[PDB]
Amino acid sequence: AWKTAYYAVEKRPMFFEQYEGGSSAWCVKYQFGAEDGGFVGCCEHGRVLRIG
Amino acid sequence: AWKTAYYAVEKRPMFFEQYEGGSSAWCVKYQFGAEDGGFVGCCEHGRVLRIG
Amino acid sequence: MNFNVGVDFPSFIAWDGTTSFPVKIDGFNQFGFTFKVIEELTADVPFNIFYHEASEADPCVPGPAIRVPDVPFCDGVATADGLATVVIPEAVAVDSFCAGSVPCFNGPWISIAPVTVNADSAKVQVTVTMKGATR
Amino acid sequence: MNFNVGVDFPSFIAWDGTTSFPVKIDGFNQFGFTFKVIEELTADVPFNIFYHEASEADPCVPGPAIRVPDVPFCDGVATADGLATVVIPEAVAVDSFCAGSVPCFNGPWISIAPVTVNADSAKVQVTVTMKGATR
Amino acid sequence: MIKLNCRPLCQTPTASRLVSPPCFICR
């Protein structure tokens, strides 16, 4: 049961910025990033099948 | 007589700035400074008492 | 009112002066050290910080120790060899304690041991604390 | 990101398996214990809780040990001798920790030691945690 | 190089005898 066995947490989407400290008069550099995470909920609401 | 036995000279007050060469997309840096000076005037215009 | 603080902020021995004990930080999301002295010191005592990976044979037993890698902060110094360490000075009094923690988590277990074993080493005690449970 | 949790919630050794160390609780208005095991146990191991107070020769050294008194709760049984004790169950697993604390402060120092020192009492580790510094 | 935080477990500043000018003596 996925709606209570594992949760996904969203904080901030991706962004792009120009790095001035490295952008010389003959080169260009860019930076990007985002923040997200996830954690497990109920451990009893799931099952897994494997070859024995 | 301090007004002639010692002088204080000031050139520029304090200031604050942000250093763009170190400010990446994940850190910040600040810089500040000031300039001051002082010199001894008439030597004989003062006295000092000490234990002997 | 007193409280059962150990329920939310447990603590475990790390260095008792004779043996070093692995501490499992996997189950908690934050942690930190605490140092105390029990007698006057003669010379400074530096400590090495390690971490362990789960043994390939059994996930309940830690593997061999691995030195923690140093990380520079927002600006400035870095370690000479790039490996984190801690040093306790002489000026520290007998009736006080010290606190410090690494910035990075790394492996599920953590550990600490002195650089060299001597009389001064046994005169120190180290305990670990964890701040948040997640299981 | 973790924190220097030891700044706010320091912990100190109270019994390393061979010696019992008095702990000062004067400056902290809450505290509690934490128990852990390092080997399979052969039988239950009980402990006694003591408290100390300022020594005569110096206000910063503890005096002789004073046994803690019992405090019956809202409604329930009271100890057969009116003194607090802690009994560690035999079934305790190696990968678990136990937490418990006394309801009353008494003297500004605290201590703990086993009822009888033997090969079985060396398999336990007790640590005290503080909270809420008042200075 | 971890930087530590330190503060003591005592609050008793030792007493310091105050000294006042003695009686006058002829030079």
TrEMBL record, chains A, B:
Species in which this protein is naturally found: Agrobacterium phage 7-7-1
Name of this chain's protein: Major capsid protein
Full-sequence portion shown in this chain: 418 to 469 of 469
Tree of life domain: Viruses
Protein location: Virion
TM helices/strands, residue ranges: none
TrEMBL record, chains C, D:
Domain of life according to the entry: Viruses
Name of this protein: Structural protein
Organism annotation: Agrobacterium phage 7-7-1
TrEMBL record, chain E:
Top-level taxon: Viruses
Protein name (Swiss-Prot/TrEMBL): Structural protein
Native species: Agrobacterium phage 7-7-1
Lineage per the UniProt record: Viruses, Duplodnaviria, Heunggongvirae, Uroviricota, Caudoviricetes
